[PDB]
Design an enzyme around this catalytic site. Structure first.
Site, PDB file in Angstrom:
ATOM      1  N   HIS A 107       0.688  -0.827  -0.177  1.00 27.07           N
ATOM      2  CA  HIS A 107      -0.021   0.251   0.148  1.00 27.07           C
ATOM      3  C   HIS A 107       1.077   1.127   0.162  1.00 27.07           C
ATOM      4  O   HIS A 107       1.370   0.577   0.234  1.00 27.07           O
ATOM      5  CB  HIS A 107      -0.572  -0.114   1.074  1.00 27.07           C
ATOM      6  CG  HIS A 107      -2.171  -0.707   1.685  1.00 27.07           C
ATOM      7  ND1 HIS A 107      -2.973  -1.120   0.079  1.00 27.07           N
ATOM      8  CD2 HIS A 107      -2.478  -2.180   1.967  1.00 27.07           C
ATOM      9  CE1 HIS A 107      -4.061  -2.317   0.479  1.00 27.07           C
ATOM     10  NE2 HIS A 107      -3.065  -2.781   1.467  1.00 27.07           N
ATOM     11  N   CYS A 155      -0.284   2.037  -4.304  1.00 27.92           N
ATOM     12  CA  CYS A 155      -1.493   3.263  -4.309  1.00 27.92           C
ATOM     13  C   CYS A 155      -0.842   4.761  -3.976  1.00 27.92           C
ATOM     14  O   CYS A 155       0.829   4.746  -3.448  1.00 27.92           O
ATOM     15  CB  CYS A 155      -2.445   3.554  -3.416  1.00 27.92           C
ATOM     16  SG  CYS A 155      -3.820   2.330  -3.899  1.00 27.92           S
TER      17      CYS A 155
HETATM   18  C1  LIG Z   1      -3.440   0.108  -3.186  1.00 27.66           C
HETATM   19  O1  LIG Z   1      -2.697   0.241  -2.594  1.00 27.66           O
HETATM   20  C2  LIG Z   1      -4.037  -0.780  -3.882  1.00 27.66           C
HETATM   21  C3  LIG Z   1      -3.544  -1.685  -5.027  1.00 27.66           C
HETATM   22  C4  LIG Z   1      -2.325  -2.238  -4.360  1.00 27.66           C
HETATM   23  O2  LIG Z   1      -2.851  -3.450  -3.204  1.00 27.66           O
HETATM   24  O3  LIG Z   1      -0.708  -2.670  -4.640  1.00 27.66           O
HETATM   25  N1  LIG Z   1      -5.124  -0.203  -4.473  1.00 27.66           N
HETATM   26  C5  LIG Z   1      -6.468  -0.809  -3.798  1.00 27.66           C
HETATM   27  O4  LIG Z   1      -6.340  -1.744  -3.004  1.00 27.66           O
HETATM   28  C6  LIG Z   1      -7.707  -0.231  -4.625  1.00 27.66           C
HETATM   29  N2  LIG Z   1      -9.380  -1.359  -5.376  1.00 27.66           N
HETATM   30  C7  LIG Z   1      -8.750  -2.310  -5.603  1.00 27.66           C
HETATM   31  O5  LIG Z   1      -7.690  -2.220  -6.457  1.00 27.66           O
HETATM   32  C8  LIG Z   1      -9.690  -3.463  -5.528  1.00 27.66           C
HETATM   33  N3  LIG Z   1     -10.187  -4.046  -7.048  1.00 27.66           N
HETATM   34  C9  LIG Z   1     -11.091  -3.699  -7.716  1.00 27.66           C
HETATM   35  O6  LIG Z   1     -11.569  -3.433  -7.756  1.00 27.66           O
HETATM   36  C10 LIG Z   1     -10.835  -4.397  -9.192  1.00 27.66           C
HETATM   37  C11 LIG Z   1      -9.290  -4.010 -10.444  1.00 27.66           C
HETATM   38  C12 LIG Z   1      -8.727  -4.932 -10.673  1.00 27.66           C
HETATM   39  C13 LIG Z   1      -9.763  -5.556 -11.208  1.00 27.66           C
HETATM   40  C14 LIG Z   1      -9.904  -5.951 -12.521  1.00 27.66           C
HETATM   41  C15 LIG Z   1     -10.661  -6.752 -13.616  1.00 27.66           C
HETATM   42  C16 LIG Z   1     -11.932  -6.816 -13.187  1.00 27.66           C
HETATM   43  C17 LIG Z   1     -12.213  -6.020 -12.071  1.00 27.66           C
HETATM   44  C18 LIG Z   1     -11.239  -5.528 -11.319  1.00 27.66           C
HETATM   45  C19 LIG Z   1     -11.474  -4.880 -10.107  1.00 27.66           C
HETATM   46  C20 LIG Z   1     -10.344  -4.845  -3.819  1.00 27.66           C
HETATM   47  C21 LIG Z   1     -11.249  -5.058  -4.722  1.00 27.66           C
HETATM   48  C22 LIG Z   1      -8.698  -5.233  -4.025  1.00 27.66           C
HETATM   49  C23 LIG Z   1     -10.464  -0.930  -4.164  1.00 27.66           C
HETATM   50  C24 LIG Z   1      -9.313  -0.782  -3.134  1.00 27.66           C
HETATM   51  C25 LIG Z   1      -8.526   0.662  -2.374  1.00 27.66           C
HETATM   52  C26 LIG Z   1      -8.566   1.301  -3.415  1.00 27.66           C
HETATM   53  O7  LIG Z   1      -6.968   2.045  -3.946  1.00 27.66           O
HETATM   54  C27 LIG Z   1      -9.784   1.931  -4.629  1.00 27.66           C
HETATM   55  C28 LIG Z   1     -10.788   0.344  -4.669  1.00 27.66           C
END
Ligand SMILES: *[C@H](O)[C@H](CC(=O)O)NC(=O)[C@H]1N(C(=O)[C@@H](NC(=O)c2ccc3ccccc3c2)C(C)C)[C@H]2CC[C@]1(O)CC2
Lengths: 166, 87
Positions: A107, A155
């Protein structure tokens, strides 16, 4: 995850890319190429990074196919990460190496990478400026004049990265 | 004593822009990681890593649902870094 299989340069294709504007490559049979992968999946105060093993698999498979011996470090604090980077920088294998890759997955915020203990109340942050400093000519003389590739999957705050238009 | 540049031959490549989110599928992994692997497999042979990172940013150009813009940071690469896969 991913197989990380790469399209290979032919002997002719490699020789065609010839110049004093390219980084030199060391002998395949004797070079000791290293890569580090730091991946934080489980955290104290912030959510678990489910799917991070698919990323480790793919990056490890690719880096090996590119000729690097891969070291994988998981679930560390910003202090643990700093000590790990200090150890990596002083590995004797960089002397008989022509390059390096550092892969960070965690993160993050605008300031930097999150450690396992990060919270709004008590921060656990590894700044990008610290990564460069630990790998610079002074702290890592063995990587002098050799490319240092840093990859950051994180992020950089919580904004959606968009502006809406009519 | 002889001087050397304290900081040279670096390239950092982040998954999104300053202040902004990066996306990760919970079972299939990170989007930026998946794209970087694919462009590396395809282009390590004919392009320098700086050109590959540009190609990765190009694949994110259209904001489709989960928008993110990978960015190249603090670049001090003085030469072309060709990976020469197979050598
Ligand atoms: C920031 O550190 C982090 C990335 C990481 O862990 O390296 N970002 C998040 O966790 C963000 N979120 C998500 O990534 C959510 N994923 C999706 O909703 C998603 C991603 C990719 C994808 C591809 C094809 C079809 C569907 C999807 C869906 C989560 C469920 C893991 C969420 C939580 C926090 C965020 O910063 C924003 C929303």
């Amino acid at each position: 995850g991913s197989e990380g299989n790469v399209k290979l340069c032919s002997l002719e294709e490699a020789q065609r890319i010839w110049s004093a504007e390219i980084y030199p490559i060391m002998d395949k049979s004797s070079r000791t190429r290293l890569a580090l992968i730091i991946c934080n999946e489980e955290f104290d105060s912030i959510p678990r990074r489910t799917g991070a093993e698919v990323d480790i698999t793919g990056m490890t498979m690719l880096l090996q196919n590119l000729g690097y011996s891969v070291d994988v470090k998981k679930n560390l604090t910003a202090s643990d990460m700093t000590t790990e980077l200090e150890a990596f920088a002083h590995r004797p294998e960089h002397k008989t190496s022509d390059s390096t890759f550092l892969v960070f997955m965690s993160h993050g915020i605008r300031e930097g990478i999150c450690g396992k203990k990060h919270s709004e109340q008590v921060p656990d942050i590894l700044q990008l400026n610290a990564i460069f400093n630990m790998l610079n000519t002074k702290n890592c003389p063995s990587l002098k004049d050799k490319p240092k590739v840093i990859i950051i999957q994180a992020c950089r705050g919580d904004s959606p990265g968009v502006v809406w238009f009519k | 004593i002889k001087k050397a540049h304290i900081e040279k031959d670096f390239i950092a490549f982040c998954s999104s822009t300053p202040d902004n989110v990066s996306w990760r599928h919970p079972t299939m992994g990170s989007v930026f990681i998946g794209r970087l692997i694919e462009h590396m497999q395809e282009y390590a042979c004919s392009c320098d890593v700086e050109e590959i990172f540009r190609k990765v940013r190009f694949s994110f150009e259209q904001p489709d649902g989960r928008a993110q813009m990978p960015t190249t940071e603090r670049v001090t690469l003085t030469r072309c870094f060709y990976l020469f896969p197979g050598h």
